[PDB]
């Protein structure tokens, strides 16, 4: 009685997924009622919904008198159940694609939408519903309730197409979006590195001016500071933040650096005239101005990049877990379908089924561990 294992496993995993998803959704609602709703939250919630659907349609029915058997109902119920399973699979595949596309948009081309839906998620759900229509034609109450397809290779065109549209194409698109996103993030990183280096050289040269005792060294340090300031001022913000012409920058960043360079020029004039002490006093005033103006902007810029990187890493983790969990299932199904050597079977499909459900029950934990507010809410 191997079912002792099989059914039992289904039970527990079902519980897991259900519980976890429920909890996460609850947290979201709280964060949507306390005034901290977020643009990404919608996506996450919808993904959770997809997971729930999978469970309610795939491991619960399969957690029946071994689903495919008698005592189900009329052909209509069987066809509807299979359609629900296929739409659940498509939604699980495509919600991650929608999340990755949203990340790409927010990282590359920053731009209505409701509080529980938006354009990309609705598009993914609609595509999932409309692409699973064939499941109604193929499946019926054939008699158990199985599906008979066209004898001329009904499999190499159905199962292969399912694998191509659910796993191959969405995963390839997600990989392309991920590599583009990481290129963009690495770009926004060397620019902040250049700004940090300019700040470091400015500080070091200011210290040198303080320690100096002759006009030559003071003037050389001032020249280094001036070049560094000019280079830094020409550092447009990355695409991950506000538009470059705006009050925060045009009024305080560029103007701050203009006043900086003016003070540097005045110190240089004093040094050229030959009054080193006046140059040192001007350098101290320069320190005061730079600390007042640019430190907060640099600190703020160092934080938004961190949040963007954290969310991108969360999305990458979700994608990696999803592929690791669903690849064996599609691989085995395609192997059986396309290959003529399909006959061999030791009934490993139960393990692939459980592994596929692992991703659905794991996604909420992935999200919780990557969001401080949500993790605190789960408390």
């Amino acid at each position: 009685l191997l079912a002792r294992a099989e059914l039992a496993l289904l039970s527990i995993v079902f519980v897991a997924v259900a519980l976890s998803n429920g909890l996460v959704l609850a947290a979201l609602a709280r964060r949507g009622r306390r005034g901290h709703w977020a643009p990404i939250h919608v996506f996450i919630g919808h993904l959770c919904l997809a997971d729930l659907a999978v469970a309610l349609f795939q491991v619960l029915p399969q957690l029946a008198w071994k689903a495919t058997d008698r005592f189900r109902g009329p052909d209509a119920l069987c066809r509807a159940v299979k359609y629900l399973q296929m739409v659940g699979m498509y939604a699980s595949s495509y919600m991650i694609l929608a999340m990755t596309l949203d990340r790409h948009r927010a990282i590359c081309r920053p731009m209505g939408s409701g509080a529980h839906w938006n354009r990309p998620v609705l598009v993914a759900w609609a595509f999932s519903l409309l692409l699973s229509l064939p499941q109604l034609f193929i499946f019926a109450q054939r008699n158990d309730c199985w599906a008979c397809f066209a004898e001329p290779w009904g499999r190499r065109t159905y199962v292969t197409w399912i694998a191509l549209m659910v796993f191959v194409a969405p995963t390839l698109g997600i990989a392309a979006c991920q590599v583009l996103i990481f290129r963009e993030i690495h770009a926004a990183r060397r620019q902040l590195a250049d700004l940090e280096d300019n700040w470091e050289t400015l500080n070091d040269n200011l210290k040198v001016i303080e320690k100096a005792d002759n006009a030559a060294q003071v003037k050389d340090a001032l020249t280094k500071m001036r070049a560094a300031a000019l280079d830094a001022q020409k550092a447009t913000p990355p695409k991950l933040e506000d538009k470059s012409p705006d009050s925060p920058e045009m009024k305080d960043f560029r103007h701050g650096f203009d006043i900086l360079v003016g003070q540097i020029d005045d110190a240089l004039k004093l040094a050229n005239e030959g009054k080193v002490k006046e140059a040192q006093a001007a350098a101290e005033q320069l320190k005061t101005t730079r600390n007042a103006y640019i430190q907060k902007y640099l600190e703020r810029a160092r934080s938004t990049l961190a949040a963007v990187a954290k969310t991108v890493r969360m999305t990458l983790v979700i994608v990696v877990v999803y592929v690791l969990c669903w690849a064996p299932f599609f691989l085995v199904q395609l192997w059986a379908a396309w290959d003529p050597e399909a006959p061999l079977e030791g009934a490993p499909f139960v393990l692939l089924m459980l592994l596929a459900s692992l991703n659905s029950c794991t996604n909420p934990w992935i999200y919780a561990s990557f969001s401080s507010s949500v993790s605190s809410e789960l408390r």
Epitope: T223, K224, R226, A227, A228, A229, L230, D231, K234, D258, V261, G262, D265, L268, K269, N272, E273
Partner: antibody
Framework: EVQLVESGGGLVQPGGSLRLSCAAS????????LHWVRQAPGKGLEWVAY????????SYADSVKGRFTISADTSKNTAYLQMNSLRAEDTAVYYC?????????????????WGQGTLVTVSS | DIQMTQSPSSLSASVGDRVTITCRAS??????VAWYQQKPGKAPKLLIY???SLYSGVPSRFSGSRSGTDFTLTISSLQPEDFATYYC??????????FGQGTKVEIKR
């Protein structure tokens, strides 16, 4: 509209004195710093001196420091360069260039309006 | 003192030939490099007023680019009037002006 004209060049002897002048038309000398750049016959350009009438700041090159003296007159709107203790290497064509002040674009447009240049020859 | 060196002492080219002139600075001047064109018996003429920004009245024929400390002036299509000497200036500060050696462009044969 904008024009710089130099005058005062000529032939002199080593150790003599000379007085180059540059007159600007179309703008105010106060709003721009005036630089003197010399080019030896057949050689590359070489910055010589500069003055800024707004603050009175002046600067000279090391090779000619302590000999030349650059001044300006806003009423007549003209810059002057008094050259003393000349030598053979001082022979060159002296152009006068205009360079805007720091804030904004006038600074990034470096020497955007030169003059025709005046020839100076040092020889016994 | 900041020293600017131009590798090409003299480039020979024919009409319609793209040409490039390179300059290197001792220190790092923050895109404070200008490119001038001088013809015999004439004062220089400001072609490029920054590392890359073109000046008014100059055809788009000329262009400039910067890479850290390398600076390059590129002419796409060479015209009969293009033939003339070219100078690279570093203007980080009023008292730190320093020109290059000069690159002479002349017809090919």
């Amino acid at each position: 509209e904008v024009q710089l004209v130099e005058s005062g060049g000529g032939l002199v002897q080593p150790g003599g004195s000379l007085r180059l002048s540059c007159a600007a038309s179309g703008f105010n000398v106060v709003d721009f710093s005036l630089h003197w750049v010399r080019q030896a016959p057949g050689k590359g350009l070489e910055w010589v001196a500069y003055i800024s009438s707004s603050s009175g700041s002046t600067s000279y090159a090391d090779s000619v420091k302590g000999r030349f003296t650059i001044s300006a007159d806003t009423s007549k709107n003209t810059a002057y360069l008094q050259m003393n203790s000349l030598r053979a290497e001082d022979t060159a064509v002296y152009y006068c260039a205009r360079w805007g002040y720091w804030p904004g674009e006038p600074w990034w447009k470096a020497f955007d309006y030169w003059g025709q240049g005046t020839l100076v020859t040092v020889s016994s | 003192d900041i020293q600017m060196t131009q590798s090409p002492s003299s480039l020979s080219a024919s009409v319609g030939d793209r040409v490039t002139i390179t300059c290197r600075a001792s220190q790092s001047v923050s895109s404070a490099v200008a490119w001038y064109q001088q013809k015999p018996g004439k004062a220089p003429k400001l072609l490029i007023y920054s590392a890359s920004s073109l000046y008014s009245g100059v055809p788009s024929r000329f262009s400039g680019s910067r890479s850290g400390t390398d600076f390059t002036l590129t002419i796409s299509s060479l015209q009969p009037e293009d033939f003339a000497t070219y100078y690279c200036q570093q203007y980080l500060y009023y008292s730190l002006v320093t020109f290059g050696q000069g690159t002479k462009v002349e017809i090919k044969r």
